[PDB]
Structure formats: C-alpha cells, structure tokens
C-alpha cells in the first residue's frame, strides 16, 4: 500500500513559535511537531471523514480533534471528527491525555474504521482531542498524528493501526517505509520500493521495544570524532520530526565547525576559568573523566553539568590529539556556541561551501551528511535564513544518552522499519 506524503518544509511563523516556547525518561513529551515537514491523509469513519496527520514512528496512538472541541482555539483552524455522521462508530469514553514538547491534548477514546490509503483499519481505537493547547497546534498544518510507533509507549495502551492492519490481514510484509525524498515522500505499509533507494539496506536491530530505537555508534563532523557517543548511543528514528536531536556536548562541537550562531554560556565560561586547568591536567594526568568533577567538587548541578560536557570536549580535544595550550581557550570559544533553546542556530547560506559533511557510524556504516542535507533554508532567498539542522536533546540519562533521527536523516536515507525482523533499515534514497 502506498502513501503519499506533501512536504511543508518548516517556514518562519514556526520557527519564531518554536522560539517563544525534560530528559529523565519520556521523549514523547519532548516532541515539537513544528518541526514536522511531511504530512499524509487518513480517514476516520464510514463514509470517511478525512484529515492530515503526521506519520508518526515517534508515537503509538492516533488522535484526531473532536467535534466536541469547544474551547481550544486551535480547534477552530482544524478538522473535527464526527462520531454521529459515522455510521461504524463505537463509543468508547475512557478519558486520555497526551503531553508533547511545544503543547498538549486530552479528550478521550472512540473507535471506528480508519483508512490509510485502501486499508479499512476497524476497530481501530483512537482519541478524539476535546481539548489540545500548546503553540504546536496552534501553528499546525495537520490535524492529528498517526502512531507508528509500538504499543509499549501507547496511552490507555491502545492497539495501533498497524499492530491492526499486519494482523488483520491488510499488509504483505509487516514491514513499512519511508522516503521522504520524493524531489513530498512516500510511507508504503507491507513493503518497500526498489526505486527509492540505491543499494541495499544496513540493518540494525529494534534495541529497546518501545520506541523504533536501534544502537547507534560515533558521530563525526569532517572526519573528525565528537568522543561522547564513540562508546556508542542511541538513536529513535523519527519520522514525526525533522532536526536531529542529539547531545549538547556533540552540537556545541557540530556548532563550532558549522558556523551555528550558538548562545554563550556563563557557566560553561566559568568552569573554563575556575576550573580550566585543573580539569585539564587532571585529564593529562591521565585522572578517570567520571571522577574528575566529583574530585574538583562540582558534582550545584547546572554547574556539574557544564564540567561533565567540559571534562568531555577535553578528552576528545586529546583524543585528536591537539596541543594543550589550545584546549582551554578552544573550549573557551564551544562555550560560546552552546545551543541556544530559542534563538535558532543560523548559519550563512554561503557559508555552506566550507562545511563539513558530518557522518554517524550505524552498522558498522558511516552515513553521511552533506551540508545541503542537514542545514535548512527557511525563508525568502536574498534575505533567506539557514540553521542547523540539529537540537539539543541532553539525551535522556540512563534512557540512553540518545539521538533521534528525523527527516533530515531519513530525507537522505531511505529507512525501513521492519517489525516482523524488529529493526531498522537504512539505505541512501533515490
């Protein structure tokens, strides 16, 4: 089955929305759907009552409004579900609430017949939103989202669309995919196409079932490692997203030799000063990184914070070998790059001549990142606005020091998540 998907690349109302506005654990409640640039049609309902979602591997419940949506003023930029103009509806009031990064939806369940392109999903159990605050949909140029994801993370622990359609016996293959380079995209329920992709595909397997994680290696920015993830990390395809979310440490480095405007950090300038060379000749002393901040007695916390992410950026400036003389006043400067969690990290749109190709290590591959792939243009040409194409997302600790990897990873690799196989698959798109 074959879904078509419109691209909507992110535009300058989100970005200033996303301006205006956690870790331990859910990730869910770290989504930004501003950032979503793909979108797709499903109908809820016989006849059919049809709306735009998003295609969400990052998630495992569909939710569309409801009609009886009184007072979210986002309600009334949206469609709206009409369980009585319905004639397969089933009521099924258990109340439910789904928290995201950029705003939130409660309303409660339902059920009835979804249809993906000519899939006529029944039973399917869903949330109709009684209510959804937050800029996200506010902004939104969709209606709901579609779960991909599996059932492990779902709310009220709802069987999702495709746990019905590959056991219902609507799908070939319990496979799915995506090409989000269609230069709008393609997702295709039961299979794949050889035509969206140049040679085979590396796959990894499905680590943690809950989220379509696998284990992700090192990443490196013209060549050159970042260290933190080397001893691996991990990494949610997600196709409900497009910026790559990975740790602070890495993007203040990704920063740096991108030329992303980045906001200074004081703490960060003050372990620097303070503490600059005693954690570094700890570091030459070869002391263990782990004790280094305890034994300088940093680890309130958002300054133990700034040691650990600078006890790192030192370990791999030593690692690549470089000159101490130069460490300190390097880490100086990424102290100067943090990510700014508002200011969008811009870049010069000529500047992308000098980039280098970031890469990260999967299967034993290195899938690389040309400049023209992970920064976007978002605006009018002369006076255009281009950023890097990554966020912070201090990765959620002991959940995996993780990645999630958006459209402007599976833009370029055409990803295949196999749930029969429980893994992933990434191949170069066509």
């Given at each position: 089955?074959?879904?078509?998907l ?9 970005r ?19 950032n979503?640039?793909?979108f ?41 579900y ?34 993906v ?19 996200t ?15 492990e ?31 709008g ?65 890495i993007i203040?480095?990704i ?11 004081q ?75 508002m ?88």
């Amino acid at each position: 089955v074959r879904i078509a998907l419109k691209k909507r690349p992110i535009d300058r109302n989100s970005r200033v929305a996303t301006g205006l506005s956690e870790e331990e654990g859910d990730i869910v409640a770290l989504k930004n759907y501003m950032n979503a640039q793909y979108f797709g049609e499903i109908g809820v309902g016989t006849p059919p009552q049809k709306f735009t979602v998003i295609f969400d591997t990052g998630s495992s419940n569909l939710w569309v409004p409801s009609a009886k949506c009184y007072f979210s003023i986002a309600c009334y930029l949206h469609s709206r579900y009409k369980a009585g103009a319905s004639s397969t509806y089933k009521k099924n009031g258990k109340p439910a609430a789904i928290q995201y990064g950029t705003g939130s939806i409660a309303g409660y369940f339902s059920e009835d017949s979804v249809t993906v392109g000519d899939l006529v999903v029944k039973d399917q159990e869903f949330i109709e939103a009684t209510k959804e605050p937050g800029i996200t949909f506010l902004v939104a140029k969709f209606d709901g989202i579609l779960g991909l994801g599996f059932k492990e993370i779902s709310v009220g622990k709802a069987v999702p669309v495709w746990y019905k359609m590959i056991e219902q016996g609507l799908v070939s293959d319990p496979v799915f995919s995506f090409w989000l380079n269609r230069h709008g995209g393609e997702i295709i329920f039961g299979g794949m196409d050889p035509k969206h992709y140049v040679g085979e595909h590396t796959y990894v397997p499905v680590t943690q079932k809950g989220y379509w994680q696998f284990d992700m290696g090192d990443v490196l920015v013209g060549g050159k490692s970042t260290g933190f993830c080397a001893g691996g990390c991990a990494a949610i395809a997600d196709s409900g997203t497009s910026l790559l979310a990975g740790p602070t440490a890495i993007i203040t480095e990704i920063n740096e030799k991108i030329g992303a405007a980045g906001v200074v950090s004081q703490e960060c300038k003050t372990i620097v000063s303070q503490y600059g060379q005693q954690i570094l000749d700890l570091l030459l002393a070869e002391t263990q990184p782990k004790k280094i901040c305890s034994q300088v007695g940093l680890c309130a916390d958002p300054m133990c914070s700034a040691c650990e992410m600078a006890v790192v950026w030192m370990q791999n400036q030593l690692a690549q070998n470089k000159t101490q003389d130069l460490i300190l006043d390097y880490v100086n400067q990424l102290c100067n790059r943090l990510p700014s969690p508002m200011g969008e990290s811009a870049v010069d749109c000529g500047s992308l001549g000098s980039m280098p190709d970031i890469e990260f290590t999967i299967g034993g591959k290195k899938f690389a990142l040309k400049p023209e792939e992970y920064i976007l243009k978002v605006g009018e040409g002369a006076a255009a606005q281009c950023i890097s194409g990554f966020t912070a997302m201090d990765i959620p600790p002991p959940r995996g020091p993780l990645w999630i990897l958006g459209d402007v990873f599976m833009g370029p690799y055409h990803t295949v998540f196999d749930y029969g196989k429980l893994r992933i698959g990434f191949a170069k798109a066509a």
